Amino acid sequence: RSHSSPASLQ
Amino acid sequence: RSHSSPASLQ
Amino acid sequence: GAMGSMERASLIQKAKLAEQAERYEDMAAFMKGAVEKGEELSCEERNLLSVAYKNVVGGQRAAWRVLSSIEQKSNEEGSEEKGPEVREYREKVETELQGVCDTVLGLLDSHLIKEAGDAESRVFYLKMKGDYYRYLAEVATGDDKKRIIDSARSAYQEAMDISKKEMPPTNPIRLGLALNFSVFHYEIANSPEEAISLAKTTFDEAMADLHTLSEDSYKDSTLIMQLLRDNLTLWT
Amino acid sequence: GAMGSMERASLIQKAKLAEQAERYEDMAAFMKGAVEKGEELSCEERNLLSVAYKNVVGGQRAAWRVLSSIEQKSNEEGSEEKGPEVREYREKVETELQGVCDTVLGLLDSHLIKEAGDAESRVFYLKMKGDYYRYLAEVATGDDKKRIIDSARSAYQEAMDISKKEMPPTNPIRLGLALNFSVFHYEIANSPEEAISLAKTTFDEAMADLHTLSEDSYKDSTLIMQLLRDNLTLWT
Numbered sequence: 001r002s003h004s005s006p007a008s009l010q
Numbered sequence: 011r012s013h014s015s016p017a018s019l020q
Numbered sequence: 021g022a023m024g025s026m027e028r029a030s031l032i033q034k035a036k037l038a039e040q041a042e043r044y045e046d047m048a049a050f051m052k053g054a055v056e057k058g059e060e061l062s063c064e065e066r067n068l069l070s071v072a073y074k075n076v077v078g079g080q081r082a083a084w085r086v087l088s089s090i091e092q093k094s095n096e097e098g099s100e101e102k103g104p105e106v107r108e109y110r111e112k113v114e115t116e117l118q119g120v121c122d123t124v125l126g127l128l129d130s131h132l133i134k135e136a137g138d139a140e141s142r143v144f145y146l147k148m149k150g151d152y153y154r155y156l157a158e159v160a161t162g163d164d165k166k167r168i169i170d171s172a173r174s175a176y177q178e179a180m181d182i183s184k185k186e187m188p189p190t191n192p193i194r195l196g197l198a199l200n201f202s203v204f205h206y207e208i209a210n211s212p213e214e215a216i217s218l219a220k221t222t223f224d225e226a227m228a229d230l231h232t233l234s235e236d237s238y239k240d241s242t243l244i245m246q247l248l249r250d251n252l253t254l255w256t
Numbered sequence: 257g258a259m260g261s262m263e264r265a266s267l268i269q270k271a272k273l274a275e276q277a278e279r280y281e282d283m284a285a286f287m288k289g290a291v292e293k294g295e296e297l298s299c300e301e302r303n304l305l306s307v308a309y310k311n312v313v314g315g316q317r318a319a320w321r322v323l324s325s326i327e328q329k330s331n332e333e334g335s336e337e338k339g340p341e342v343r344e345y346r347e348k349v350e351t352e353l354q355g356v357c358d359t360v361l362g363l364l365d366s367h368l369i370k371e372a373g374d375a376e377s378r379v380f381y382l383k384m385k386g387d388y389y390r391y392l393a394e395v396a397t398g399d400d401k402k403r404i405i406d407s408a409r410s411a412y413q414e415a416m417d418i419s420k421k422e423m424p425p426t427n428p429i430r431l432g433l434a435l436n437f438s439v440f441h442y443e444i445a446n447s448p449e450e451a452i453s454l455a456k457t458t459f460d461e462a463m464a465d466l467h468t469l470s471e472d473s474y475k476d477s478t479l480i481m482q483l484l485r486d487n488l489t490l491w492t
């Protein structure tokens with residue numbers, strides 16, 4: 001599968 | 011900690 | 021809501037405790053309660069909200085994929101039919117996943133997005149709206165799939181417009197938005213060329229902005245850049 | 257119960273699906289429903305029951321330990337007091353853990369233990385009764401701690417008596433029983449000498465019975481033997 005963003009973002 | 015049994019037992 | 025009687029600060033404190041305890045269902049309920057207090061969320065609190073629900077829905081998505089695979093194989097040629105149980109249970113998980121998406125989308129629409137008075141907060145929430153419509157799209161089929169997909173597109177696209185006007189190319193929210201929109205394009209909207217083009221432009225423009233960052237910011241930006249690179253390797 | 261309208265076989269099928277999906281709360285609800293059909297459980301079904309609830313309560317125990325540690329440090333000398341929130345949330349998790357133990361113990365008492373017509377089934381259920389009283393003991397304090405501990409002891413001891421009369425020393429249920437009773441002795445009942453003595457005797461007597469086993473049975477027995485050995489290394 002494709003990677004999506006981690007949940008926490010600065 | 012001490013180890014206890016796994017959940018499944020034959 | 022059952023969190024109505026608890027103080028906002030206590031809910032945030034307990035969300036952080038639940039995260040330490042890996043109790044993500046609790047964490048999501050605490051953060052829902054905090055949102056429903058009606059005050060704007062800080063950057064940290066927005067991340068707590070996202071972590072909680074992303075973990076909750078992530079477990080549901082992983083289960084749905086396991087079950088959907090089983091179901092597809094019990095429907096293959098020569099594969100006996102073990103009755104309704106696989107479909108039923110996949111439908112149960114699907115419905116619970118849909119309820120979580122509905123809950124998050126409801127928080128965003130009442131009233132996080134409209135009250136978001138910063139580019140960073142408004143992009144964060146619009147990205148989340150796109151993400152949770154995407155999770156609905158992953159399990160959608162009949163006659164509403166197309167409209168769910170376009171709701172995800174509309175949300176991502178508005179977030180993209182703001183982020184490009186208001187944030188630098190290395191901004192981690194801008195980067196995670198572009199990553200997730202590229203995954204939308206590739207996996208949901210059958211637009212692999214758009215996905216590739218977006219991931220390439222996103223990576224290259226961020227690479228050229230790294231020199232402006234502190235070491236702390238550089239670390240956050242490059243983590244997401246590597247995900248863009250990893251996808252481009254899969255896709256090309 | 258909400259599982260009353262589902263067929264026994266469908267509940268078992270779905271418990272197995274939930275295990276594949278790592279949906280252990282679902283798995284436990286399905287197996288509770290299967291037990292409440294009133295028929296005896298097979299060896300496989302007993303294991304499904306145990307896996308489901310052990311995973312559910314294991315997550316609760318891990319959370320309780322995280323939270324209890326936080327709580328103990330916010331009560332150390334010079335450690336500021338952040339209000340009631342840590343205690344409250346630890347109490348919430350504790351109460352949920354206690355409810356799971358109550359539910360399992362209720363299934364065993366109505367009527368798994370009394371209807372168990374084999375040594376292997378009766379020992380399995382009595383071991384489980386001891387285990388779930390032990391989990392209650394881990395969080396017990398005032399004036400009921402001692403009685404919960406002795407309920408765990410009484411259950412383990414009856415299981416031990418049957419297993420020694422009716423099963424060979426390598427029987428995996430006998431072995432896992434002895435392991436867990438030794439952990440009871442060491443961690444709950446402040447009886448480290450009993451724990452060590454039991455683990456040593458259990459290991460040595462099993463070692464001398466391995467030659468009677470097939471490769472399949474030998475594998476099951478030696479896995480638990482290594483846990484006995486690992487504990488003896490910690491304890492001596």
Ligand SMILES: *SCc1cc(N[C@@H](C)CN)c2cc(C(=N)N)sc2c1
Nearest residue numbers: 008009010063064065067068071240
């Ligand atoms: S908005 C400031 C902020 C940053 C982070 N860190 C991520 C961007 C990288 N780890 C953060 C993490 C939180 C958590 N998961 N408890 S809250 C928060 C806030």
Ligand SMILES: *SCc1cc(N[C@@H](C)CN)c2cc(C(=N)N)sc2c1
Nearest residue numbers: 018019020299300301303304307476
């Ligand atoms: S009672 C026959 C039986 C044996 C096992 N295996 C364990 C003893 C070792 N893996 C078993 C595992 C089950 C599961 N977790 N789905 S059910 C079952 C039955």
Ligand SMILES: C[C@@H](CN)Nc1cc(CS)cc2sc(C(=N)N)cc12
Nearest residue numbers: 118121122125126156164167168171
């Ligand atoms: C048609 C589509 C949006 N165009 N709507 C939805 C469909 C489903 C599948 S049952 C769940 C939800 S949850 C939700 C919300 N905004 N809270 C909207 C929807």
Ligand SMILES: C[C@@H](CN)Nc1cc(CS)cc2sc(C(=N)N)cc12
Nearest residue numbers: 354357358361362392400403404407
């Ligand atoms: C005093 C002790 C047994 N001697 N009883 C219990 C105490 C607690 C802590 S609130 C929970 C449960 S659940 C349960 C059961 N058999 N279902 C018994 C108990």
